[PDB]
Amino acid sequence: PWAEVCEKFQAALALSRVPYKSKYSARALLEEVKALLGPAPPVAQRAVRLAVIEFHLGVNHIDTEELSAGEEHLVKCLRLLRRYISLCIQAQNNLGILWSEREEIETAQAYLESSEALYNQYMSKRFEKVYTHNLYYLAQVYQHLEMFEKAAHYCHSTLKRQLEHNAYHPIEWAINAATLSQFYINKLCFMEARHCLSAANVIFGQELYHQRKGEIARCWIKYCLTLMQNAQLSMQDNIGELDLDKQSELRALRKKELDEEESIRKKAVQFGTGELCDAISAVEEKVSYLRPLDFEEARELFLLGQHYVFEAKEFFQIDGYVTDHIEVVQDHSALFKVLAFFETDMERRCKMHKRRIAMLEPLTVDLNPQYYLLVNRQIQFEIAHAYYDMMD
């Protein structure tokens, strides 16, 4: 009655999928399976089958992970597994999270490392999934280990596999780019970061339905902010009209070739297999921006395009964060004019100043004693009048 046994297994299996809804009877099924271990009695493969059963019995022994006996059983299973398919590393990973509970990171680390090594040592749905799950688990570990860059590497590879397959959702993509941006900003790899949000711009082809756009625009602002901060490598208050004393190399073939060498890695992000790489290629027009000089006009236009989005986000904010983001844009706008170190232009100052006044009034809505919130706004006026002083 081998099949009948397998049917009982099947049933139990289905029941494992199924006022307690679990344990009560599931534990009986655990034992029912053990009862079937009886009947189970080449033999080597029998043992393999049995080991798998024991894996599931170990899984049955969880109960909020209180059943450490199950842990022991899994260890016993591991031994049996080590004697000589991929479930074994899945199980290993399950042991890894128990070490996490036991704070034994190092062993869990080793487990995960070997899980990957074994795949690589080797060389229609499960693998695709768990492969990336493992990377996720590693990232968590890395957080504790502070392996910053490795976690980042994995992030990209999970997005990679996501791209390989059809596991998509536009918002998630957008926010992913949002985080990646900042990462590379902190790492100063601006030139790579360039493709990230712009990659999301490709994604844009398909509540947050409309609101999501502003978050994106915020990030676009941040790009530009950092780019100006890059300009701040050479500070105006220690120089006169002279600058760019440094080398040119703004079109260096040196940089081109070295980037070609580096971009062997970088370009992996272009998982558009030509088609979307072409979409990206259209987008590359803006990705091309690197170390510009007299393009302040263009710089402001970059804002403008996303300023329109900003305006929409104002529609999407409840007269609170509206003013918070206006602050951002105002300063940002002023900074573009800061870049434009020319005498005949204080109009932006005036333009944003008008906004400052309008933004002051809202204290009527917020009469909480938000002293420093107001002080910040007052500081913005300090700055405004400091800029007046700057002018005169």
Author numbering: 5 to 22, 32 to 54, 86 to 128, 135 to 173, 200 to 282, 301 to 486
Provide the publication's sentences verbatim.
Kinesin-binding protein (KIFBP), which is mutated in Goldberg-Shprintzen syndrome, binds to and inhibits the catalytic motor heads of 8 of 45 kinesin superfamily members, but the mechanism remains poorly defined. KIFBP interacts directly with the motor head of Kinesin-2 (KIF3A), Kinesin-3 (KIF1A, KIF1B, KIF1C, KIF13B, and KIF14), Kinesin-8 (KIF18A), and Kinesin-12 (KIF15) family members, resulting in inhibition of motor-microtubule binding both in vitro and in cells. We show that KIFBP is a tandem repeat protein constructed of nine helix pairs that assemble into a solenoid-like structure. Collectively, our work describes the molecular mechanism of KIFBP-mediated inhibition of KIF15 and KIF18A via binding to and stabilizing a conformation of the kinesin motor head that is incompatible with microtubule binding.
After determining the structure of KIFBP alone, we used cryo-EM to determine the structure of KIFBP bound to KIF15. Unexpectedly, when we docked the structure of KIF15 into the reconstruction, we noticed that the α4 helix of KIF15 was missing. Instead, we noticed the presence of an additional α-helical density within a cleft of KIFBP, suggesting the displacement of KIF15-α4 into this cleft during complex formation. In the structure, KIFBP occupies the microtubule-binding surface of KIF15, sterically blocking access to the microtubules by KIF15. The most notable structural change involved the repositioning of KIF15-α4 away from the kinesin motor domain, placing KIF15-α4 15 Å away from the location found in the crystal structure of KIF15 (37). The adjoining loops on each side of KIF15-α4, Loop-11 (“KIF15-L11”) and Loop-12 (“KIF15-L12”), accommodated the repositioning of KIF15-α4 by facilitating the extension of KIF15-α4 away from the body of the motor domain. Whereas KIF15-L12 remains extended in solution, KIF15-L11 is positioned away from the motor domain and binds along KIFBP-HP4a. In addition to seeing changes in KIF15-L11, KIF15-α4, and KIF15-L12, we saw that the overall structure of KIF15 adopted a more open conformation. The structure showed the shift of α helices KIF15-α1, KIF15-α3, and KIF15-α6 away from the core of the motor. Thus, KIFBP blocks microtubule binding by sterically preventing microtubule interaction in addition to allosterically altering the KIF15 motor.
